[PDB]
Every structure is written in structure tokens, then in C-alpha cells.
Amino acid sequence: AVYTLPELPYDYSALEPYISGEIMELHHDKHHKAYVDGANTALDKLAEARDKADFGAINKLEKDLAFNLAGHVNHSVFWKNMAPKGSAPERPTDELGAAIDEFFGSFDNMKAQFTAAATGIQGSGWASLVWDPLGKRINTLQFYDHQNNLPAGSIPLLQLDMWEHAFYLQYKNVKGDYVKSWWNVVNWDDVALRFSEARVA
Amino acid sequence: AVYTLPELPYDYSALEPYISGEIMELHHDKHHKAYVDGANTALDKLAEARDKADFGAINKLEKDLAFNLAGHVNHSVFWKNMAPKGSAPERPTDELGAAIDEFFGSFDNMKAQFTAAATGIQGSGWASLVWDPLGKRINTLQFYDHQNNLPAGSIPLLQLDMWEHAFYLQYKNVKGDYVKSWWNVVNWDDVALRFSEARVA
Amino acid sequence: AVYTLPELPYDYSALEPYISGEIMELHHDKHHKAYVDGANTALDKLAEARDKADFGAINKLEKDLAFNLAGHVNHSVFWKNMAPKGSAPERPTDELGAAIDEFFGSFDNMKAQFTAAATGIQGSGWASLVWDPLGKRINTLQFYDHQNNLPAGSIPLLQLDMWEHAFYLQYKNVKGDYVKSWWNVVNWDDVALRFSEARVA
Amino acid sequence: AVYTLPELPYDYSALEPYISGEIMELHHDKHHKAYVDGANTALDKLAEARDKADFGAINKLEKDLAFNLAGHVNHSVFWKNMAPKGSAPERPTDELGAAIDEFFGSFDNMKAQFTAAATGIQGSGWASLVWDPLGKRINTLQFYDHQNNLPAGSIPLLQLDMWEHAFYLQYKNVKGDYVKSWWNVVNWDDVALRFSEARVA
Ligand SMILES: [Fe+3]
Ligand SMILES: [Fe+3]
Ligand SMILES: [Fe+3]
Ligand SMILES: [Fe+3]
């Protein structure tokens, strides 16, 4: 197939007590898998459309593609953005740390802005730290669902899943507690790597 | 300022009779300029939010940023994607040409899918040919407004503005005639350059 | 058919000089007609789906229905909400006038809020004065496209089309001039009638 | 206050085993309450905007109003649409029953279409049976979030909450099992009452 489900870079319960293994198992094995299958199906349908010269369902297929592919991209980044506490730095350093200070003033300011973007979402969505190739800077974006509210060319560096399936079983309606806990498992090494390769447009 | 209004790489009337100079002037001088100002204003507002430590309007600011920056990005690519008839080949060649046949079967198949995506939009939007870094392929996407219905990381190669302001003064409600005439001014050299630079992950 | 295109309650050029007959002709005969045909097609497709027990395109059909039916409802109200200047009152009176003062403070306050909602839209949309059956009050809503950003049960009283096709040929990019001119042709008698029948849930 | 949190017409655990009491408590006491507060706050902010004559945040306030009020409306209908098994007939009768056969062919056909609309949502949303005043018929709509994908004037008759918080704690990712169990607690008497009152234009 074109798209494949990546394996988690750690055990399902490696993020505990911050994120339960039960959520990790359902989130990865069920939800992420659905997006991969959906993105592949969308491409197969578009190929069939071209062969028969029948683009009647083009509007449906383009949304199926955007929704599922965005879901695949977002989750793929999400898994790598995390690591068991202690396995990675608790704060950004070197170039990344300097860039964050440059575009947000300080790490604390970026954290506050990112947290506000995460908890204020009206519906399903993501809080995202991206590299803007046009402005050559790091911005925070608030995705709606998986594929809305973002400029083309945006390169994801750090993402936080704010869909209810990401925290409900453990934190219930208290999304604030989920966000606080999540900061403990952010893999700043992964974010630093993405930044190193992203700041080249 | 972080964002700047790029000058057109040709005269306002250089795309006639396909796209009138009247539309080119209003589209560039008024519409695009508004998105540049809006993107700059959003960043300024976010900076003030951090200094004041008040993120009450975070939802508004994140949408203002995404909408305006996406408008700026989309129009910036749009201008470069076009050139006076006779300036570039009327059909993709070399590496780009081979990639189009690989991912769509033929140039005609690509045109058909792109055209269907452009004319079927329910509301304002864009038909877009992008490079998908994850699947390492060229896909067609149908943007809603400027910032919706697309996966993060999508690299724009060729874009067609389907907002009514882009064609109404000349083609009125007949979207099909607009898209048909537009193919005549596509600068395949610019698209090929973007593909080359995008391909290098 | 289930849905039919209503005829304009006046001649195409009756709203001049405020709204040109050229816009009225295209807007009614072309755009509105498309929504009626689209809504009817959506229903036929859903019927075919039930017969064959094939709901594969349900997501597409439900959006086709919402988009087109909303477009039909919005435009149907829009035509009746207008009348040649002098043929109707220039300001709300009696119950309607009292209700507007009650929920907005004054006619001028309602006009300012409505105007701001109309000119600030990011993309295609409508500025709408609706009756809220749950709160038993009159509110202003900002529709996105035709079918987004509104509570179920909302009863339209006064609507202003902010899609670019509604003003571009005459006012170009200056949506502010369009809104100012539009106030001159509002049929307050039609709005008063809708209010009389709407305030019953 | 303009909006108030309605009390449940039954005990929190009266819908078991179909819908757990744990979900009913969180759903009503936490989620619904938040939408009521949000709708009230939006109105207060709009009132302040008028007094200060500053509508700079109009786009934010109109979305806050639509999102929260729609959430309030949707949940208010949702609670009344359900009742303990045995309280009402398991199948529509009389006027409502005849209307369902007229617009869907049969009760089973309606259930199939409604179920497909409920399980196919890409993101948060609702499956809704509404009375269309323009076409004078009963249609099924698929809401996105709380306030998207619906025509103005739509009168809700029967609604099913498909947001993840509505079923995750009990059914996890298996949306189909949730919808299947939900049909057992549908209060057809409430739906029939809404149809009667909606029908009277
Ligand atoms: Fe997720
Ligand atoms: Fe444009
Ligand atoms: Fe219109
Ligand atoms: Fe809910």
C-alpha cells in the first residue's frame, strides 16, 4: 500500500502514569490504523475515477483524502514527539531553545500560548508548533479536526492531540490535567531533529 | 514586517486575454495585500497576548493567522505559477512530466482530476497539486477558503484560485471557461522548480 | 420536484441604483437555480441509497443536501427581504421596532452589529438576524458559506448575502459600500411579518 | 441569565445498561453546563461590544455564540429524546409513523439512513432527524461539531450525539454498538410531540 501504520517507538505503557497504555493501544491500533486504511482507500478511488473518467464523487474523495491523510500525518508525528519521562530532556536546548526564545520570548511564553491553543479548541483538533517556511519562523497553530485551520507548507514540529479519544478514558472532561501531564513526556530531541530538517523550507 | 506583498513577475495585463488586467490589479493590489496585513496583524496580536499573559482571544488569533497566512501563501504561489503565453512550454517535460504520468497515468488524466476538483468546490476554495512528503507522491487537494481541507506538510506545486473574485468580472458564473483559459498561462518551469526543491525532502 | 425556484417579487432592475439588475439576473437565474437543482438531486440520491441499501456516499449526500438546501433557504429569504426604495419603511416599527430596541438597545446598535458581522466574514457567508426560539430573543449570526455557524431551530428574519457574487460586478472589493447601499432596499414589512410568525417557536 | 441548564427528566442511571450513569452525569453536569455558560458569556460580550461601539472581536463572538448555543440546543433536545426502556413504544405510531413511511419508505429505511449518517461522521458531530419547513418533509442531516452542516430554519425532532464524550467511556471506539444500544431508549412520544408542533409551520 501507499501508506502504512508506523509502530510505536516504545511500549504501550511506556508513557505512564501520564498517558495510560489503554489509551495508547486504542489510539494507535484502532484510530491511527483507520486513517491509514482511509487514506489508501481514497487514493484507490481517485485512481478508479481517472480510469473511467468519472469524477462525480470528487468532492467526497478529496475530503476523504485530506481527513485521513492529515490524521495519519498528525498521529505519526504525535508518537515520535513523545518519550518516557527521563528518556529525553525536559526542556529545549541549543538551536531549538534559541529559536523558541526568538519567536516567543521564552520557553514559558511558548508553553503558555501552546497550552491556551490546546484547551480553547471548539470541537476536535490539535495544538501545533510549526515551521513557517515563508516567514522563516516558528508559530503555533490550532488545527480543527485533522485537516483544517492551517497554511499549506506548514511543517509540524510538535503536536498535541486534543480529540476526546486522546484523553477521555483517563482525564474525563478535564482537558487541563491532560495538557499538564503531557508536557512531562515531550521528546525535545525529536522536536529538535524536525526543526533541523524543517528550517530548509 | 514579517510578511511582505511580493510584486508580480509580469505586467498586470500580460496574462490577457485569459485573465484580464482589471482582475490582476484588484486581485494583487487589494486582495493579496489584505492577507499580508492580516497575517502581520495576527502575529502582532499574539505577541501582545504573550506580553500581557492574556490568551482570551487565542481562538480568534489562531484563525486570523491561519486564514491570512494561508491567503498570503496561496496567492504568492499563484502569481509565480503563471506566465505570459509563449514564455514556457504548454506541457510538462522531463522530471515533472515523468512524475505526472507516474502518479496520474497521463497529463490529460491529471488535468481532468484537477479540473473536477476546481469546478466542484462548494464555497470559496482552491484546486491544488501538492507534493506529499509522507507518501512521496503528487496528489491533488481541494482547499476550502484558504486554510481548510489539507494535511500539514503539504508542499504546493501548482494552485488555481477558485474564489469568485478571481474570475467573476470576466467569466461571471461560468467557472468552467475560467479554468479552461487558465491552463494556457500555466508556467510549467515554475512548477518544475517547486517539484525539484520539494522532492529533496 | 420537491424544491422550486421562486420568482422575484419585483423586476430585476427594481433595486437600482443600489443593486444592479445584472447582478440580480445572474444571482437569481443562475446561482439560486443551481441550489434548487442541487437540493433536489441530493434527495433523489438519498432515495436511491435507501432502495439499494447502499449508504456509501452518505457523507457526500448529507453535505450536498445541507449546502444546497441552505443556499435555497437563504436566497429565498434574501429576495423577499428587499424591495425598491420608497416601497417600504426605511426603519422597523411597532413590535419589531420594540423587539430590536429590547435585544440591541436601539436600531442603530443593531445596524452597527449587523454591519460588523457582514464585513468581517473570512470567506463566503451571510450576516443574519434570527429569532432564537430557545432564548426567545433576536440575535445576529454570521453564517459561513450557506450552512455553517448556526444553531438548529434558528429562524431567519433578515439576511445579507456576503458571497462575492452578490456584489463584485458593481462594488468590486469594497464590501463596505455594498453593505451601506443594501440598507436602502431592506423591506422592513417582510421582516416584521417573519417576526410575527417566528416568535411562536 | 438568558440560558439555563435544564434538569434531566429521569435519574442519571435510568438509561442503563444502554447508556451508563457515569456518562450521563459527566455529559449533563459538565459538558452541557459548559455550553450554557458559554452561550450566556457570548451574549454578555456582544452587549458590551455594542455599548463600547467596538466590534473588533465580532468574528470570535459570533462563533462563540453559534457553537455554545447550538451545543445547548442539541443537548436539550437529546435529553428529552430519551427515556427508560418501557416508558414509550419501541416504534413510531400514528401521525409520526405515517410521516416516516412517507419520507423514508419504512421505519427500517429511516433507521438505516440515520445510522449511516451517525457512524460516518469525520470528526465530532450529530445525526439528526429534522422537519424541513420549506419542503414540508422530514430529512436526516449530519451536523459537524454542533453548529455546522445544516440549513437555517431546520427544526430538530430526533438527535443523536456522536461526539466521543457521548460514548467513549462505555463503548470506546466502537461507534456502531453505541448507536445500536441507543435505539432502545428513544422516546418516540417526545419526537411525536415535536413533529406535531413543528408541522404547524
Ligand atoms: Fe487522535
Ligand atoms: Fe484570490
Ligand atoms: Fe448568493
Ligand atoms: Fe455531547
From chain A residues 71-100, the ones with a CB under 8 A of any chain D CB are: none
Compute the 3-state secondary structure of chain C and give helix, strand, coil in percent, each to the nearest 5: 55, 15, 35
From chain A residues 144-173, the ones with a CB under 8 A of any chain B CB are: 144, 146-156
DSSP designation for A175: H
Instruction: Give the SS3 label for residue A27.
Output: helix
Residue B131's DSSP bridge partners are B138, B155
Instruction: Give the SS3 label for residue B157.
Output: strand
DSSP designation for C26: H
Neighbouring residues of B165: CB distance < 8 A, sequence distance ≥ 6: B23, B26, B27, B31, C164, C168, C173
Question: For C74, phi and psi rounded to 5 degrees?
Answer: -60, -50
Q: Does C116 touch chain A (CB under 8 A)?
A: no
**Grid coordinates of A175:** 482537558
Q: Does A67 touch chain D (CB under 8 A)?
A: yes
Answer whether B31 sits within 8 Å of C163, measured CB to CB. no
Distance CA B107, CA B186 (A): 13
Residue type, D87: S
In degrees, to the nearest 5, what angle opens at C-alpha D65 toward C-alphas D166 and D118?
Answer: 30
Please name the member of A73, A120, A143 whose beta carbon is closest to the beta carbon of B134.
Answer: A73
To the question of whether residue D31 is assigned a binding role by annotation, the answer is: no
Give one DSSP letter per residue of B88-110, joined into a string.
S-SS--HHHHHHHHHHHSSHHHH
Find out whether A139 and B147 touch, Cβ atoms under 8 Å: no
Distance CA D93, CA D109 (A): 16
End-to-end CA distance of chain B: 29
Neighbouring residues of C52: CB distance < 8 A, sequence distance ≥ 6: none
Distance CA A148, CA A131 (A): 17
Q: Does C7 touch chain D (CB under 8 A)?
A: no
Please classify residue D13 by burial: count the beta carbons closer than 10 Å to its beta carbon, then call 0-12 exposed, 13-18 middle and 19+ buried.
middle
Find out whether C154 and C138 touch, Cβ atoms under 8 Å: no
Answer whether C164 sits within 8 Å of B169, measured CB to CB. no
Residue type, C189: D
Answer whether A153 sits within 8 Å of B51, measured CB to CB. no
Distance CA C6, CA D180 (A): 42
Instruction: Give the SS3 label for residue C96.
Output: helix
Q: What is the 3-state secondary structure (H, E, C) of A113-142?
A: HHHHHHHCCCCCEEEEEEEECCCCEEEEEE
In the sheet with A155-161, reading across from the earlier edge strand, the strands are: A137-144, A125-132, A155-161
Please list the alpha-helical segments (H only) found in A28-174.
Answer: 33-52, 58-80, 94-104, 107-119, 168-171
Answer whether A152 sits within 8 Å of B113, measured CB to CB. no
Chain B residues touching residue A134 (CB < 8 angstroms): 3, 69, 72-73, 76
Tell whether the torsion through CA atoms of B126, B127, B129 and B131 is positive or negative.
positive
Distance CA D61, CA D55 (A): 9
Q: What distance lies between CA D200 and its chain's CA centroid? A: 21
Instruction: Give the SS3 label for residue A90.
Output: coil
Distance CA B31, CA C35 (A): 27
Q: Does A176 touch chain B (CB under 8 A)?
A: no
Question: For C132, phi and psi rounded to 5 degrees?
Answer: -100, 105
CB crowding B129-144: b at 16 or more within 10 Å, else e: bbbbbbbeebbbbbbb
Query: Closest Cα partner for D23 from D145, D146, D144, D182?
Result: D182
How many other β-carbons are positioned within 10 Å of the β-carbon of residue B62?
A: 29
How would you classify residue C94: left for phi > 0, otherwise alpha for psi between -120 and 50, otherwise beta? left
How would you classify residue B102: left for phi > 0, otherwise alpha for psi between -120 and 50, otherwise beta? alpha
- D145 Cα to chain A: minimum distance (Å): 6
To the question of whether residue C75 is assigned a binding role by annotation, the answer is: yes
- State the greatest distance between any 2 C-alpha atoms of chain B, in Å, as a whole number: 56
Find out whether D75 and D161 touch, Cβ atoms under 8 Å: yes
Element of type H or E holding A158: strand A155-161
Identify whether D17 is preceded by a cis peptide bond (ω within 30 of 0).
yes
End-to-end CA distance of chain C: 28
Distance CA B160, CA B95 (A): 22
Q: Does A134 touch chain B (CB under 8 A)?
A: yes
| Cα–Cα distance list, C130 to C136, C141, C152 (Å) | 10, 7, 11
Neighbours of C, requiring at least 3 CB pairs below 8 Å, are: A, B, D
Query: Closest Cα partner for C201 from A172, D21, D196, A24?
Result: D196
Chain C residue with the nearest C-alpha to that of D49 = C113
Tell whether the torsion through CA atoms of D47, D52, D58 and D64 is positive or negative.
negative
Find out whether C95 and C196 touch, Cβ atoms under 8 Å: yes
- A60 Cα to chain C: minimum distance (Å): 5
Q: What distance lies between CA C78 and its chain's CA centroid? A: 4
Find out whether D71 and D151 touch, Cβ atoms under 8 Å: no
Query: A144 C-alpha vs ligand 1 centroid, how far in Å?
Result: 12
Chain B residue with the nearest C-alpha to that of A66 = B150
| Cα–Cα distance list, A80 to A6, A156, A190, D38 (Å) | 10, 12, 7, 35
DSSP designation for C83: -
- For chain C, count helices (H), then strands (E): 8, 3
Answer whether D57 sits within 8 Å of B60, measured CB to CB. yes
Which residue has cell 436526516?
D140
Residue C148's DSSP bridge partners are C144, D148
**Grid coordinates of B7:** 510584486
Find out whether D67 and D73 touch, Cβ atoms under 8 Å: no
- D130 Cα to chain B: minimum distance (Å): 23
For chain B, strand residue ranges (E) read 125-132, 137-144, 155-161
Distance CA A169, CA A21 (A): 11
Distance CA D133, CA C76 (A): 13
Please name the member of B31, B67, B172 whose beta carbon is closest to the beta carbon of C122.
Answer: B67
- B60 Cα to chain D: minimum distance (Å): 5
In degrees, to the nearest 5, what angle opens at C-alpha D117 toward C-alphas D112 and D119?
Answer: 95
CB crowding B95-124: b at 16 or more within 10 Å, else e: ebeebbeebbeeeebbbbbbbbbbebbbbb
Identify whether D84 is preceded by a cis peptide bond (ω within 30 of 0).
no
Find out whether B162 and B127 touch, Cβ atoms under 8 Å: yes
Question: For A75, phi and psi rounded to 5 degrees?
Answer: -70, -35
Query: A32 C-alpha vs ligand 2 centroid, how far in Å?
Result: 35
Instruction: Give the SS3 label for residue C149.
Output: coil
Distance CA A175, CA A120 (A): 10
Q: What is the 3-state secondary structure (H, E, C) of chain D?
A: CCCCCCCCCCCCCCCCCCCCHHHHHHHHHHHHHHHHHHHHHHHHHHHHHHHHCCCCCHHHHHHHHHHHHHHHHHHHHHHHCECCCCCCCCCCCHHHHHHHHHHHCCHHHHHHHHHHHHHCCCCCEEEEEEEECCCCEEEEEEEECCCECCCCCCEEEEEEECCHHHCHHHHCCCHHHHHHHHHHHECHHHHHHHHHHHHCC
Query: B194 C-alpha vs ligand 1 centroid, how far in Å?
Result: 32
Distance CA A68, CA A65 (A): 5
In degrees, to the nearest 5, what angle opens at C-alpha C8 toward C-alphas C6 and C14?
Answer: 175
Query: A163 C-alpha vs ligand 4 centroid, how far in Å?
Result: 13
Identify whether A17 is preceded by a cis peptide bond (ω within 30 of 0).
yes
Helix axes C33-52, C58-80, angle to 10 degrees: 150
Please name the member of C26, C63, C144 whose beta carbon is closest to the beta carbon of B172.
Answer: C26
CA dihedral A88, A91, A96, A102 (to 10 degrees): 170
Q: Does C63 touch chain A (CB under 8 A)?
A: yes
| Cα–Cα distance list, D37 to A55, A65, C102, C138, D65 (Å) | 45, 37, 22, 19, 11
For chain C, strand residue ranges (E) read 125-132, 137-144, 155-161
- C186 Cα to chain D: minimum distance (Å): 20
Breaks following residues of chain A (C-to-N distance > 2.5 Å): none
D contact test, residue of C48, C62, C106, C138 with most D CBs within 10 A = C62
Q: Does D55 touch chain C (CB under 8 A)?
A: yes
Distance CA B24, CA D117 (A): 43
| Cα–Cα distance list, D186 to A90, A115, D80, D165, D192 (Å) | 50, 39, 9, 19, 11
Distance CA D49, CA D43 (A): 10
How many other β-carbons are positioned within 10 Å of the β-carbon of residue A52?
A: 9
- Ligand nearest to C-alpha C35: 3
Find out whether D142 and D123 touch, Cβ atoms under 8 Å: no
Please name the member of C64, C146, C173 whose beta carbon is closest to the beta carbon of B26.
Answer: C173
CA dihedral D141, D142, D148, D151 (to 10 degrees): -10
CB crowding D113-152: b at 16 or more within 10 Å, else e: bbbbbbebbbbbbbbbbbbbbbbeebbbbbbbbbbbbbbb
Identify whether B17 is preceded by a cis peptide bond (ω within 30 of 0).
yes
| Cα–Cα distance list, D33 to A145, D4, D28, D36, D75 (Å) | 23, 8, 7, 5, 10
Q: What distance lies between CA B28 and its chain's CA centroid? A: 13
Neighbouring residues of A96: CB distance < 8 A, sequence distance ≥ 6: A188, A191, A192, A195
Please classify residue D14 by burial: count the beta carbons closer than 10 Å to its beta carbon, then call 0-12 exposed, 13-18 middle and 19+ buried.
middle
Query: B199 C-alpha vs ligand 1 centroid, how far in Å?
Result: 28
Answer whether B165 sits within 8 Å of C169, measured CB to CB. no
Chain C residue with the nearest C-alpha to that of B170 = C169
Instruction: Give the SS3 label for residue C133.
Output: coil
Method: X-ray
Q: Which domains does chain D have, with CATH numbers?
A: 20-83 (1.10.287.990), 84-201 (3.55.40.20)
CB crowding C30-47: b at 16 or more within 10 Å, else e: ebbeebbebbbebbeebe
Q: How many residues appear in chain A?
A: 201
Please name the member of D124, D169, D173 whose beta carbon is closest to the beta carbon of A123.
Answer: D124
Query: B34 C-alpha vs ligand 3 centroid, how far in Å?
Result: 23
Chain D residue with the nearest C-alpha to that of B60 = D60
Give one DSSP letter per residue of C43-76, joined into a string.
HHHHHHHHHHT--TTHHHHHHHHHHHHHHHHHHH
Distance CA B123, CA C74 (A): 14
- State the greatest distance between any 2 C-alpha atoms of chain D, in Å, as a whole number: 56
Query: Closest Cα partner for C122 from C143, C139, C92?
Result: C143
- Ligand nearest to C-alpha B125: 2
Query: Closest Cα partner for C39 from C86, C75, C13?
Result: C75
DSSP designation for B32: I
Instruction: Give the SS3 label for residue A58.
Output: helix
Distance CA A24, CA A14 (A): 9
Query: Closest Cα partner for A168 from D163, B196, B149?
Result: D163
To the question of whether residue C189 is assigned a binding role by annotation, the answer is: no
CA dihedral A69, A73, A76, A78 (to 10 degrees): -130
Query: Closest Cα partner for C63 from C46, C83, C79, C85?
Result: C46
Answer whether B59 sits within 8 Å of D63, measured CB to CB. yes
Environment of ion ligand 2 (residues, CB < 5 A): B 161, 163, 166
Please classify residue D191 by burial: count the beta carbons closer than 10 Å to its beta carbon, then call 0-12 exposed, 13-18 middle and 19+ buried.
buried
Answer whether A63 sits within 8 Å of D169, measured CB to CB. no
> To one decimal place, what's the resolution in Å?
1.6
Query: A128 C-alpha vs ligand 1 centroid, how far in Å?
Result: 13
Which residue has cell 455599548?
D51
Query: Closest Cα partner for B112 from B196, B18, B183, B189?
Result: B183
DSSP designation for C19: S
Question: For B188, phi and psi rounded to 5 degrees?
Answer: -65, -20
Which residue has cell 454578555?
D44
To the question of whether residue C161 is assigned a binding role by annotation, the answer is: yes
Distance CA C28, CA B32 (A): 29
Answer whether D173 sits within 8 Å of A26, measured CB to CB. yes
How many other β-carbons are positioned within 10 Å of the β-carbon of residue B166?
A: 24
Query: Closest Cα partner for C69 from C145, C144, C1, C147?
Result: C147
Element of type H or E holding A143: strand A137-144
How many other β-carbons are positioned within 10 Å of the β-carbon of residue B201?
A: 8
Distance CA B61, CA A142 (A): 10
